[PDB]
């Protein structure tokens, strides 16, 4: 029963090996697993000058995770031929907490091409600039909301019983009980936030001279940067174009 | 697709220890044509490339409505989408009123009235109601647009009438699926090119 | 006992490989499988110089996904020769969430192309273009109405039981009780709403010059893109078609 | 007892394999079987300049679906020997949402063959074009009524019982002690509504000149096309004719 598992093992990790060998920039690989909690361990040679993108690492890494049964795309630790550990998934004293920087870089990177593809017609191809801050907001937010509509009218309050007892003698003793059951109107709101929402955005764009531009050109470039960017008064972003000549 | 990979392939091999995933083919007017994707999570960046599909197409369907009437090049345009990924389930539960007695549904109703006469009266009256009841269970998308900003660049020809400009501006909106209720903004400028 | 598992899945893997071998622009694949939940990892060796497209990738994945007892398409890793996992399901996200844009897209073009089959007998073949936008709703919808009718008028109540003691001395102190028990009707509906349907379209048609459209012209044009759209004002639908020369 | 059900199944796909390429326009099939749900995936090489129509898939997706114990027609994956995923039930990513679109277009192009077989004996072959969008209610609906007649008059009412105690001293003390029991007409419908009903018609259709068309003649064609519809007030159904020379 041992000694089968392990010669199953030992011919699976060459099989697997094998076949990631043969797929390019991949003069050999070495995987090694840990069945028993799993994991494995893939020490790819690629092939001299080369280097698999950062999504070229989830290639091996589900081609690993996947052809092993149980086995989560977290464990696999991917290293170069001078080590190079690639996956940061492996060095955990945070490993989640740097990857809002790569995020923010993306969203901010967005942003910039966008507001550089909007004035590079009107300025010229190389006369803007921008660079953009975003505050992101990682919080994590759950919301319960419950509310009641509110039945303190009786031409819209909802009974489902109600007993009206009215007593009168006539020195004038009357009496009026009166229990009354409701139904009430109910909503019930759950929403789950976003992790990795925008926060707050400041841009800061310098457009060339050609001689100052006009201030009615300038201000219409300030209203397609600010329609570049998905400007809100609500999220308080700021926006500064400033004209000046580059060098 | 398969012939950006040609020149990615192209430029990276080319330089040594330059991998492909790293470089940014753009054409001459935005158009980042390189997929990239980012590790960490892999769900919160799902949501960028999601984002840039439905600005591009929006994009796409203002520069292929007004590229017959300005040109095929004199018009550049860029949407930002600032979309809702919260997951949203949400539960209403109505009650129709029955105050009036004239719309109230009885299931029982134990009516006793005396009366002596020093009038010495009494009414009592248990009432037992079904009542109309409405349940609505919404799980909200997650992925609407929540608001649009467009700005559109036109060149001049000299500058375009006002009145062509008031109805570049009208196609523009029915290109975005323009809402006042999500405070979407457009903003359309005719300058001349470069 | 294990050494026929492993066998019987060695010769499946081989048997499955050379049948998507068999596929066109396929040099050699290589499926690995997964089975004890299972999963698959296939890194397939495409002819050189062609590409899979999107959903040709889920004709081989639910060739693989369903030739494999228990194991769903959401599993199965393909991975080019070059790096590049092409299938993005890896995440725990948001691969349904653009199967909406396609399915957007879909809609859209199908009213384009109505617009243009019927305006294209009166304009001329490329004298029209229109560009839809569908606002669509993919939220999951649930209701349950319950509706009572009134009882209240006598003349259309049901009594199912009805007790009237009726006491009279006569100083006239009289006595009326009167328990009523009431059958009623009731309807129950029970919708479960549609996930897809067009909240509201926004239709741009240009027609070009022949030379001014006349007024009239442009009004029947008007009418029957309003008629190819599904116009409905309870929708909020909007319509603007301009007539302007081409280039 | 496993090898034995291995060396069967992994015979019986050949059995079956062969079965189907024997079928005209196939020059090679490769029927896979999982069954430990079941599940089957069949890879078939068409005849050089051939197809399988939609309704012959059918014909081969039954063919397997029955020669196999439990496996429905649901989970068999066809592809072509060119990807071509040719059975859509086995799409991954909801499987639904645009079945409807085919749906709708069916309906449609059925509507709009009819107008145009029609009117084509009148104006001509092709001196008419018509565009039929279909809006169609998906929402699954049940619905549960249950009515009661009134048993308000006496002359109408059903009794089980009655108990009718009548006292009376003669000063005039009376008493009337009246219980009674009723049996009460109750219907009970229970609607299953049809999933792809048309809730409202939009058609627009042109004629082409011979010279403007009398209004007499117009009234006619109108009149005509809206029998062709199925038009009708309480869907909200809109028509549109002009009359517009062609181009």
Same mark, same amino acid.
């Given at each position: ?15 697997? %090996? ?40 989830? %290639? ?52 910039q091409?966008?507001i550089e593809?909007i004035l590079?017609?009107?300025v010229?191809?190389?006369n803007v600039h921008a660079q953009v ?14 509310? &009641? ?32 059951? &409701? ?20 841009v800061a764009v310098v457009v060339n &001279? ?8 300038m201000?219409?470039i300030e209203?397609l940067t600010r329609?570049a960017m ?9 926006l500064n174009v400033v004209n000046s000549?580059?060098?």
């Amino acid at each position: 029963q041992f000694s089968e598992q392990v010669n199953y093992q030992r011919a699976l990790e060459g099989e697997l %090996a094998r076949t990631i060998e043969t797929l390019g920039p991949v003069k050999s690989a070495r995987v090694h697993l840990a069945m028993p909690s799993p994991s494995a361990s893939v020490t790819v040679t690629l092939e001299p000058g080369r280097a698999l993108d950062e999504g070229q690492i989830s %290639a091996v890494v589900h081609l690993v995770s996947s052809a092993v049964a149980g086995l989560p795309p977290g464990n696999v630790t991917l290293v170069d031929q001078s080590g190079h550990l690639l996956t940061q998934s492996n060095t955990s004293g945070r490993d989640l907490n740097d990857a809002q920087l790569k995020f923010a870089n993306d969203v901010e990177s967005r942003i910039q091409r966008r507001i550089e593809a909007i004035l590079s017609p009107i300025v010229g191809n190389g006369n803007v600039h921008a660079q953009v801050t975003a505050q992101l907001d990682f919080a994590n937010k759950e919301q319960t909301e419950e509310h &009641y509509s509110p039945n303190g009218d009786a031409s819209k309050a909802t009974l489902r019983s109600r007993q009206l007892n009215i007593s009168e003698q006539v020195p004038r003793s009357t009496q009026r009980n009166e229990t009354s059951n &409701y139904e009430v109107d109910r909503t019930i709101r759950h929403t789950k936030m976003n992790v990795g929402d925008i926060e707050r955005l400041s841009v800061a764009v310098v457009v060339n &001279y050609k001689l100052p531009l006009t201030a009615d050109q300038m201000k219409q470039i300030e209203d397609l940067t600010r329609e570049a960017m998905g400007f809100s008064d609500k999220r308080g972003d700021t926006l500064n174009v400033v004209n000046s000549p580059f060098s």
